[PDB]
RNA sequence: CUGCUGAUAAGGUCUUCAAAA
RNA sequence: CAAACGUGCUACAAUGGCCAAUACAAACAGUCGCCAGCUUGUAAAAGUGAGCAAAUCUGUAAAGUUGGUCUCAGUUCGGAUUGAGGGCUGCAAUUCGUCCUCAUGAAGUCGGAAUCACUAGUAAUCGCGAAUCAGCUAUGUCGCGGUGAAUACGUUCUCG
RNA sequence: GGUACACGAAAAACCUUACCUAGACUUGACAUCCUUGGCAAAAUUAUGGAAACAUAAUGGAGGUUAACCGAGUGACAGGU
């Protein structure tokens, strides 16, 4: 006799926790370095 | 409206998924080659002019 | 308006009974380019012929194809209304090809179980001049005999 | 005598072929003029990229042409070089189209 | 019907590339492909009175080299090397101060048989209201007197200011366009007339290339000396 | 005295080693029984075609290395390799092999798909109305 | 469909407005454009004006509409009857 | 070797020029 | 969205459906990526985490072979539609993403007048890769390979 | 019509986008020419906010203004 409620309320609790826990961790990238074309090491 | 769209494309948006790739020579939005940053109709012109090194016509 | 006669590729002798007609009917029952499946169908049908007729499968197959093999062909030629047909003698190669094509077409339509038994029973029935390809050959022969008059004029 | 560089694996790649052969010829000539045992200028499979572009400005997608770009690749590994060969190698001046991927 | 570009069909077989560099990544490949276009377009649209036949660009990880072949390099040089610094600063602004520029002017020998400058002269004459029949006739006769093979000139557009577009062609000599061995130089220019735009396309035949190879050799710059400086 | 042959078909190489032996030929493909390597769809007779009509009682030990192609292409490749190695033993077979044309590369390879076409030669459906 | 660890979603400007108007007794319609926000339990009892594209349609949320998206109870295009071509 | 087989709204560009090189 | 047409995919099935074991490619692509192995999960995937700037590491080949089962039925065909629970991308998936699982199980049993493509590794058929791309019922486009046919007597007719 | 209809579009949830509704701007989101100073633009954190944008903050790379950051300024920019 729940009539929905409980399960979606738990989902809403998780979503509200996520919203309150949002952190500005904006970034764009992954692996770094190792970007070169090499040479005669001094020409 | 093309100059404003070009300038807005150069300007960074406030969301990452807002960003799209436009041609750098012209301003065409669709059919852009990310390998060369140039749309198809300008890539053809550059290849026919010899601007892109190593891009020769293919015979297979 | 071509003035060139097409070449002909080799028929290849069958590597089991050494009879080219076996390879021809394999290629005729080919579907989806499955040589293995077609060969399995043919060899299973021939083994069923062994089990039933108690005679040589190659001899039974030759007796079936020779009996189904037609003699006359009716070529459609329209002039003013409908088409008046023309009886012409066929070459031996096209004769055999038509026989095999009719055999396969009437074999893949019978009411029975797996196509193995289908084609096997069709072959054994055509070996005794009582079958559906037999009816087809009879129909075209009777039609040509009826339209024997216009045989002189072809084109 | 010293070596200071064991197994110097030079790797060459370029959009053009004949320039690559000429550069490898100059390299092997210099490295044989100095006392170094070259393993050999072997070739590697050429990565070919094909781009297909519609000719027309507006319609007729059926009429489209093609372009290719080949990255010809060669390998050459030197066992022991030493300063006597390295100093001579410094003055090679490889043409721009050729690309070096020295790995030490 | 439509014909493939004469230059584009011969590129990579009997013609070298006008820009010779290998970029690091796809992001840099677009920037380097656009900067060279800007430099070439600058040299062609402005400083036009010097008859700049062609400009080639050669780049490494960080160094830009420009080879500008011109018929009258005195206009690029200026009065006691004045405009030279102006164009150097223009190029440096175009690419960046972080790089090293190696601009090099080269006097082109036997200029007349070069489709670029022939087409540029055609367009200038068209824009100057010069009659077309006389203009094309004089250009063709001077090109032939220069000592080359056939030259084909196609001039299309709103001809002489008319309301119906026409086209006028003059072929004088053998111009094998289907042959790949032939040394055919093709150029196209736009004469901006008061009545619109006129398109001039000049094909010029300069013999047959009987030596196999991707050029790596000068093309009609060699008959006189081709030694001009401004480099390091 | 061994013999070596190199056949090819449909982009599938073959290296056939013919060894003189008198204890049954014992054909072998890539260190596996041919009846298990191939689907055994009687394609075995295809590779034995040049080794059947002339002879296999000579009991040649067969060492086959195939890398590439499917199975019909591999069979054709080892057929060509067997023939070419047979050209190194009593060249008198060369005439009989040439007679039925088992000593020529088939030259048939898959064509390249063309733009605007659903395949090598197929074309889109054409509508007029 | 939407992930579990992520949970639900509201723009949180709607959430702040809903909290304020719930603490206030004399509630009025809340004019919102955020059709992407899901109807949280605290939303119950309020009335919203969702931008259908042209106007603001009023939807009264209940203890039942909890869970769906806010703009899902308002439409965007209207079609009611064709006309005979011939 | 003679089956059958009918119709298609109005007005319209397009040669500027040889004086001459 | 009452309807109409074009181009394609899936089928109407025992040359087959499902399950298990298993053999043989080419080309291409990859450091906000390819992702091996392991653990968790019915599964999409998640976590850990090597290897690879690449003839080195990664991107499971499928049809095919054998074995088991179904036994000609609107079915163990066919998957549409529909309800529920989850996964990923993304500020954000309701209008309007796709994937997995569970459940339901439309039409359709070879398609009328009339039409299309194709002359050998071609048609047919089975998979793999790439471009644009954060993600995408692209079944589309451009490429690669595996199996692999039938027919051409002739120009009387038909279109050009 | 053949020579349009898995075509432009080799990727429409936001952006793309050129359309509608609404909230905002005016030598302008972008550029040159001129009289003129550079002792900024970003980015992010607050409040109002559907977001545009406003009021306050760290006042910023640098190189003395090179590029750009401005004021004044009318020619004008701009138009898928
Ligand atoms: Mg514009
Ligand atoms: Mg996008
Ligand atoms: Mg298709
Ligand atoms: Mg039709
Ligand atoms: Mg009639
Ligand atoms: Mg009438
Ligand atoms: Mg089965
Ligand atoms: Mg290995
Ligand atoms: Mg695995
Ligand atoms: Mg099986
Ligand atoms: Mg039914
Ligand atoms: Mg099923
Ligand atoms: Mg949805
Ligand atoms: Mg049924
Ligand atoms: Mg043909
Ligand atoms: Mg939009
Ligand atoms: Mg300061
Ligand atoms: Mg100052
Ligand atoms: Zn472009």
Curated annotation (Swiss-Prot), chain C:
Part of the 30S ribosomal subunit. Contacts proteins S9 and S11. GO terms for cellular component: small ribosomal subunit. Transmembrane segments: none annotated. This is Small ribosomal subunit protein uS7. One of the primary rRNA binding proteins, it binds directly to 16S rRNA where it nucleates assembly of the head domain of the 30S subunit. Is located at the subunit interface close to the decoding center, probably blocks exit of the E-site tRNA. Disulfide bonds: none annotated. GO terms for biological process: translation. It comes from Mycoplasma pneumoniae (strain ATCC 29342 / M129 / Subtype 1). One of its GO terms (molecular function) is tRNA binding. Gene3D superfamilies: Ribosomal protein S7 domain (1.10.455.10). Pfam families: Ribosomal_S7. The keyword RNA-binding applies. Signal peptide: none annotated. The lineage of its organism: Bacteria, Bacillati, Mycoplasmatota, Mycoplasmoidales, Mycoplasmoidaceae. The gene is rpsG. Belongs to the universal ribosomal protein uS7 family. Keywords: Ribonucleoprotein, Ribosomal protein, RNA-binding, rRNA-binding, tRNA-binding.
From Swiss-Prot, chain D:
Pfam families: Ribosomal_S10. InterPro entries: Ribosomal_uS10, Ribosomal_uS10_CS, Ribosomal_uS10_dom, Ribosomal_uS10_dom_sf. GO terms for biological process: translation. GO terms for cellular component: ribonucleoprotein complex; ribosome. Transmembrane segments: none annotated. SUPFAM superfamilies: Ribosomal protein S10. Keywords: Ribonucleoprotein, Ribosomal protein. GO terms for molecular function: structural constituent of ribosome; tRNA binding. Signal peptide: none annotated. Involved in the binding of tRNA to the ribosomes. Part of the 30S ribosomal subunit. Belongs to the universal ribosomal protein uS10 family. This is Small ribosomal subunit protein uS10. The gene is rpsJ.
Curated annotation (Swiss-Prot), chain F:
Keywords: Ribonucleoprotein, Ribosomal protein. InterPro entries: Ribosomal_Su5_D2-typ_SF (IPR020568), Ribosomal_uS9 (IPR000754), Ribosomal_uS9_bac/plastid (IPR023035), Ribosomal_uS9_CS (IPR020574), Ribsml_uS5_D2-typ_fold_subgr (IPR014721). GO terms for cellular component: cytosolic small ribosomal subunit. Pfam families: Ribosomal_S9. Coiled coil: none annotated. GO terms for molecular function: RNA binding; structural constituent of ribosome. One of its GO terms (biological process) is translation. NCBIfam families: PRK00132.1. Belongs to the universal ribosomal protein uS9 family. This is Small ribosomal subunit protein uS9. It comes from Mycoplasma pneumoniae (strain ATCC 29342 / M129 / Subtype 1). The gene is rpsI.
UniProtKB/Swiss-Prot annotation, chain G:
Keywords: Ribonucleoprotein, Ribosomal protein, RNA-binding, rRNA-binding. GO terms for biological process: ribosomal small subunit assembly; translation. The keyword Ion transport does not apply. The keyword DNA-binding does not apply. It comes from the Bacteria. Coiled coil: none annotated. Pfam families: Ribosomal_S19 (PF00203). GO terms for cellular component: cytoplasm; small ribosomal subunit. GO terms for molecular function: rRNA binding; structural constituent of ribosome. Belongs to the universal ribosomal protein uS19 family. Protein S19 forms a complex with S13 that binds strongly to the 16S ribosomal RNA. HAMAP family: Ribosomal_uS19. This is Small ribosomal subunit protein uS19. The gene is rpsS.
């Amino acid at each position: 006799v729940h009539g929905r409620a409980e399960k979606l309320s738990g989902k809403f609790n998780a979503g509200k926790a996520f919203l309150e826990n949002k952190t500005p961790k904006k970034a764009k990238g992954k692996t770094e370095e190792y970007t070169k074309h090499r040479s005669l090491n001094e020409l | 409206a093309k100059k404003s769209l070009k300038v807005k494309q150069t300007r960074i948006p406030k969301f990452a998924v807002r960003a799209y790739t436009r041609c750098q020579r012209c301003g065409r939005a669709r059919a852009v080659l990310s390998h060369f940053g140039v749309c198809r109709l300008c890539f053809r012109e550059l290849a026919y002019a010899g601007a892109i090194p190593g891009v020769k016509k293919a015979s297979w | 308006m071509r003035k060139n006669r097409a070449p002909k590729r080799t028929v290849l002798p069958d590597p089991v009974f050494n009879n080219t007609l076996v390879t021809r009917i394999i290629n005729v029952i080919m579907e989806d380019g499955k040589k293995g499946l077609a060969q399995r169908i043919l060899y299973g049908a021939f083994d069923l012929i062994e089990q039933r007729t108690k005679e040589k499968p190659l001899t039974v197959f030759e007796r079936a194809v020779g009996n189904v093999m037609p003699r006359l062909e009716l070529r459609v030629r329209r002039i003013a209304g409908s088409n008046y047909q023309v009886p012409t003698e066929v070459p031996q190669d096209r004769k055999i090809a038509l026989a095999l094509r009719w055999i396969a077409m009437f074999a893949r339509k019978r009411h029975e179980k797996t196509m193995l038994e289908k084609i096997a029973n069709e072959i054994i029935d055509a070996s005794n001049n009582t079958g559906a390809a037999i009816k087809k050959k009879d129909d075209t022969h009777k039609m040509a005999e009826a339209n024997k008059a216009f045989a002189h004029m072809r084109w | 005598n010293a070596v200071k560089y064991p197994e110097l694996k030079i790797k060459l790649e370029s959009y053009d072929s004949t320039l690559l052969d000429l550069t490898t010829k100059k390299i092997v000539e210099v490295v044989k003029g100095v006392d170094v045992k070259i393993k050999g200028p072997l070739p590697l499979p050429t990565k070919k990229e094909v781009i297909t572009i519609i000719r027309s400005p507006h319609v007729d997608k059926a009429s489209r042409e093609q372009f290719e770009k080949n990255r010809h690749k060669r390998l050459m590994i030197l066992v022991d070089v030493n300063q006597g060969a390295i100093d001579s190698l410094k003055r090679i001046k490889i043409p721009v189209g050729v690309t070096l991927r020295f790995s030490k | 019907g439509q014909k493939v570009n004469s230059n584009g069909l011969r590129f990579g077989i009997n013609k070298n590339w006008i820009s010779r560099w290998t970029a690091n990544s796809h992001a840099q490949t677009a920037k380097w492909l656009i900067e060279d276009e800007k430099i070439r377009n600058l040299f062609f649209v402005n400083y036009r009175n010097a008859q700049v036949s062609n400009v080639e660009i050669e780049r490494t990880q960080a160094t830009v080299d420009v080879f500008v072949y011109a018929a009258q390099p005195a206009f690029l040089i200026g009065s006691e090397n004045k405009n030279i610094q102006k164009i150097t600063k223009q190029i440096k602004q175009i690419i960046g101060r972080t790089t090293n520029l190696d601009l090099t002017i080269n006097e082109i020998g036997s200029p007349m048989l070069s489709a670029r400058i022939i087409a540029r002269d055609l367009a200038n004459a068209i824009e100057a209201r010069v009659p077309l029949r006389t203009a094309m006739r004089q250009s063709l006769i001077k090109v032939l007197k220069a000592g080359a093979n056939g030259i084909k000139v196609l001039v299309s557009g709103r001809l002489n200011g008319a309301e119906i577009a026409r086209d006028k062609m003059y072929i004088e000599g053998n111009m094998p366009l289907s042959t790949l061995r032939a040394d055919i130089d093709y150029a196209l220019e736009k004469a901006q007339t008061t009545y619109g735009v006129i398109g001039v396309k000049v094909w010029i035949n300069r013999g047959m290339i009987y030596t196999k190879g991707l050029n790596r050799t000068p093309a009609h710059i060699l008959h006189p000396q081709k030694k001009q400086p401004n480099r390091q | 005295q061994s013999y070596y042959g190199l056949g090819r078909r449909k982009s599938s190489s073959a290296k056939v080693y013919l060894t003189p032996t008198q204890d049954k030929g014992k054909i072998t493909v890539n260190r596996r029984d041919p009846s298990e390597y191939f689907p055994n769809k009687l394609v075995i007779q295809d590779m034995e075609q040049p080794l059947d009509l002339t002879d296999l009682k000579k009991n040649f030990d067969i060492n086959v290395v195939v890398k590439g192609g499917g199975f019909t292409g591999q069979a054709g490749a080892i057929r060509l390799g067997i023939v070419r190695a047979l050209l190194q033993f009593n060249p008198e077979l060369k005439k009989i092999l040439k007679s039925k044309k088992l000593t020529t590369r088939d030259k048939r390879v898959k064509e390249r798909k063309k733009f605007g076409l659903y395949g090598a030669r197929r074309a889109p459906q054409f509508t007029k109305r | 469909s939407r992930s579990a660890k992520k949970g639900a979603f509201v723009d949180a400007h709607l959430l702040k407005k809903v909290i304020d108007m719930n603490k206030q007794e004399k509630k009025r319609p809340i004019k919102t454009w955020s059709r992407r926000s899901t109807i949280f339990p605290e939303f119950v009892g309020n009335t919203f004006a969702v931008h259908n594209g042209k106007t603001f349609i009023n939807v009264y949320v209940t203890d039942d509409m909890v869970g769906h998206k806010l703009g899902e109870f308002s439409p965007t295009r209207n079609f009611k009857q064709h006309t005979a071509n011939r």
